């Protein structure tokens, strides 16, 4: 056996984080967002109590070394939601057949596809919030936003997968409801 070791966490600034357990509890502007990690524990060492946290390893295996990054980033992104949130833009896109999506709020209702077939419905999970916006030339547009990209995204990606089609060629297929901007709610501090 060859030493990686295990441990905990890297850091930036204005947002509190757990620093303890498998679980990072990140707290900032937009609240607090927290995740529990499995085998993802790794050479921590606090560099400042409040001001510097890293986890950038001593020895171990190849596979180990990757994770370290993947770990920071994601929790960084825990910070991101907590700070500047996520805002996904989607637009329904269709040409031969018009397509309509509303938002119940608690759930998203999707109409029309190909004359409509089934009604695609997605319940609005927590903090992915959904807006059909339309003025300002907001346009066939859904907006998913909240302070967890992964969720905002997951729900989103899910949506792209909710607008799938089969049988009788991608070379005539396009139409569906596609991701148009995955972002933050804004720039924020």
């Amino acid at each position: 056996m060859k030493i990686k070791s295990h441990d905990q966490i890297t850091f930036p600034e204005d947002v509190t984080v757990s620093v303890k357990d498998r679980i990072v509890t990140v707290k900032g502007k937009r609240g607090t967002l927290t995740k529990d990690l499995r085998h993802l524990q790794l050479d921590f060492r606090v560099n400042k109590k409040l001001r510097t946290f890293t986890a950038v390893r001593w020895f171990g295996n190849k596979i180990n070394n990757s994770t370290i990054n993947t770990a920071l980033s994601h929790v960084r992104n825990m910070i991101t939601g907590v700070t500047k949130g996520f805002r996904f833009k989607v637009r329904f896109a269709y040409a031969h057949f018009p397509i309509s999506v509303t938002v119940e709020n608690q759930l998203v209702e999707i109409r029309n596809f190909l004359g409509e077939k089934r009604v695609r419905r997605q319940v609005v999970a927590d903090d992915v919030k959904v807006y059909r916006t339309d003025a300002a030339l907001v346009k066939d547009e859904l907006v998913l936003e909240g302070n967890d990209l992964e969720q905002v995204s997951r729900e989103a990606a899910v949506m792209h997968q909710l607008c799938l089609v089969k049988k009788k060629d991608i070379r005539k297929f396009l139409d569906g409801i596609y991701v148009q901007t995955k972002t933050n709610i804004e720039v924020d501090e």
């Binding site: 070791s5 295990h6 441990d7 921590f44």
Partner: protein
């Protein structure tokens, strides 16, 4: 909270070699699982190289050069007095005692046991507060039961007439007590 870092000039515990529990300090880490260790003990620990599996770091870390001499070591680590400091560590008790325990004798033993016996019935239960606290089930209960026997005495079973009869009975126990011992 993962923390007793090996740091050359760290004091490590010999954990299962025969050479267990002598002491010495890191004079090298020879890599992965091995150490180079040194002491002033006249016979064990010289400069040994020992397996890391077998060692426990003792949370006395000194400064000293990584890879080093006895002579320097002997004195600075003497100066560090960490042996003593380690000596004062509590962990230590039972096992230096263990060696002792092996070699006691009975009487000693009995006393040793007896010490706690002495305390036992004598300084916890005993008294009156903490035995007005938990107390022991019988106490606790006797007290509690006494509230539930405010029930007879005080209360809604019992004792305004029948305990008067109990008074009759009480003497009756004594009437037999007196009689029975009188034969």
């Amino acid at each position: 909270v993962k923390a007793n870092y090996i740091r050359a000039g760290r004091l490590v515990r010999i954990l299962r070699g025969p050479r267990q529990n002598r002491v010495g300090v890191i004079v090298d880490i020879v890599d992965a699982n091995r150490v180079l260790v040194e002491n002033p003990c006249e016979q064990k620990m010289w400069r040994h190289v020992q397996n890391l599996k077998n060692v426990e770091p003792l949370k006395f870390c000194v400064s000293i050069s990584r890879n080093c001499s006895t002579k320097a070591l002997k004195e600075a680590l003497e100066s560090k007095k960490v042996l003593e400091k380690y000596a004062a560590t509590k962990v230590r008790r039972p096992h230096r005692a263990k060696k002792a325990f092996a070699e006691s004798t009975d009487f000693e033993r009995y006393q040793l046991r007896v010490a706690k016996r002495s305390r036992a019935y004598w300084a916890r239960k005993i008294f009156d507060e903490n035995d007005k606290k938990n107390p022991v089930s019988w106490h606790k209960v006797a007290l509690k039961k006494l509230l539930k026997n405010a029930k007879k005495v005080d209360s809604t079973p019992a004792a305004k007439k029948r305990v008067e009869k109990a008074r009759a009975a009480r003497k009756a126990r004594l009437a037999a007590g007196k009689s029975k011992t009188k034969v």
